[PDB]
Amino acid sequence: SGISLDNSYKMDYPEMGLCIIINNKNFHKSTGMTSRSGTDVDAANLRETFRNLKYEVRNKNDLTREEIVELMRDVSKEDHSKRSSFVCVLLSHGEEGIIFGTNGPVDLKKITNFFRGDRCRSLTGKPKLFIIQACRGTELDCGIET
Amino acid sequence: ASGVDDDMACHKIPVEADFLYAYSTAPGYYSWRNSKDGSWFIQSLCAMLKQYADKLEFMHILTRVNRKVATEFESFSFDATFHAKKQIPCIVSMLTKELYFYH
Amino acid sequence: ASGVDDDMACHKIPVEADFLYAYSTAPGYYSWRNSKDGSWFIQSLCAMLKQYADKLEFMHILTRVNRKVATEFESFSFDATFHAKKQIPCIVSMLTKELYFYH
């Protein structure tokens, strides 16, 4: 055939892929973490948005740190051969490099490692997208007038 | 030319390759959320995806998200400490190719 | 609609906005350099800028750099610990617009 350039990911597999949405709104009283009002609006908006992009959306609400890890592990263990990509959206409280389960923290690295090129072979060479809505610290940007 | 670190017989890619992290905010900063309309970042991300997913490459879509959040949002709080604050999303790409949701 | 965090009378932008950090490697990882040809990242960055600066948007140029480093380079060392290693650059963008070096 003619000149072949591979500058863009192959996105015409039978499936676009999974879009896992972890929506943590209510936290265990024991942690004292405040409920994240308005997060349901985000979760719904994301579900519809990615649905229209043809992703297989799976929403999970109020997951403990253990459930977040088990979910990611199980998902990384699936056969993504016929899927073009992978998307995971995390909605919760957080700090730099950390996302909060309803009962404690989860290192983002712990979550993303399951999808490493050598640990999830059916996603090797495919885009793995992690969308994170959470604090990355306590610094405040006062901005500047334009 | 020739070297010890190139033209490998067996091709491999980094295990960290092909990851894209779309952070709602810059490293070390707070991330704002409206208790009624949702987070500034997700609100903006969905809006830009809905309007540009069938037109622009992903990084360019996320750049529009950066601009939307940076220019259109500012916090309001009865607490001076958290009032009049801004936010800039942070795109972290280890992708190796352009990404279009359409084909 | 109307809200307390939008449509500000006085427009401001985040002080962290409009920054782009082109890291040679992923967070927490080593960055490799050939004692004779230079670092893998800079070698690749210059090559892609020379070939695409008058053709592609900056993020797309950096994406080519990511691919070049990720696929074409692998370390060689007499020390097994540092032998056969890979590298993936890390693009961190807080930019709010597309960037073309030409006009």
Binding site: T34, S37, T138 | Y30, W32, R33, S75 | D5
Partner: peptide
């Protein structure tokens, strides 16, 4: 506005 919510965010700490």
């Amino acid at each position: 506005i919510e965010t700490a």
